[PDB]
């Protein structure tokens, strides 16, 4: 009980200290996976507003092993030894898809861009407002206002 509360407290200080990576890590620890999910949806929202994922020098070191460039030597020894097991590639895989989604749009790989967005939406953890945001930003203006796709009765039904 005492330990879990301290973790919650750490997260509040870390948010203040503008160490965005470290606050989520602390909430994970607090035993509140549900809250972890809620900041994930919010981070997706943030990443949409930026048009692309955030880059901090600490963030550059962890993520680099699935991202070109970005390997920046001389970040604390705790950060470097922890990540060696490749646990980060798995945990980062849903954010990575989002980030890759913008990339594919810009690369005029509009077919595949649609595919990644659909995969993310199918996960039932979205309730009705992390849906309102996506359709007006991406699905309706870019992909359904333009005709370039052949549908049929069933494909329409599923929609």
């Amino acid at each position: 009980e005492i330990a879990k509360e301290i973790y919650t407290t750490l997260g509040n200080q870390m948010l203040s200290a503008h160490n965005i990576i470290e606050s989520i890590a602390n909430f994970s620890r607090a035993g509140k996976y549900e809250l972890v999910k809620s900041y994930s949806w919010l981070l997706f929202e943030a990443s949409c507003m930026e048009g692309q994922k955030l880059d901090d020098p600490v963030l550059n070191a962890i993520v680099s092993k699935n991202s070109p460039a970005e390997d920046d030597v001389i970040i604390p020894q705790d950060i470097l030894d922890c990540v060696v097991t490749n646990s980060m590639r798995q945990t980062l895989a849903p954010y990575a898809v989002l980030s890759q989604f913008y990339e594919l749009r810009d690369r005029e790989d509009w077919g595949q861009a649609l595919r990644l967005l659909l995969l993310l939406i199918e996960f039932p953890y979205l309730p009705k407002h992390y849906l309102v945001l996506l359709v007006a930003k991406f699905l309706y203006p870019i992909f359904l206002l333009d005709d370039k796709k052949l549908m049929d009765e069933d494909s329409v039904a599923t929609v």
């Binding site: 996976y33 549900e34 798995q90 945990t91 039932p124």
Partner: peptide
């Protein structure tokens, strides 16, 4: 993706459990 899906499923199961607990209340 697999990990994320698993986590989501776990969360959903937790929610179900909570609902059942309240259902009995």
């Amino acid at each position: 993706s697999l990990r994320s899906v698993f986590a989501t499923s776990k969360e959903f199961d937790g929610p179900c459990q909570n609902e059942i607990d309240l259902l009995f209340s």
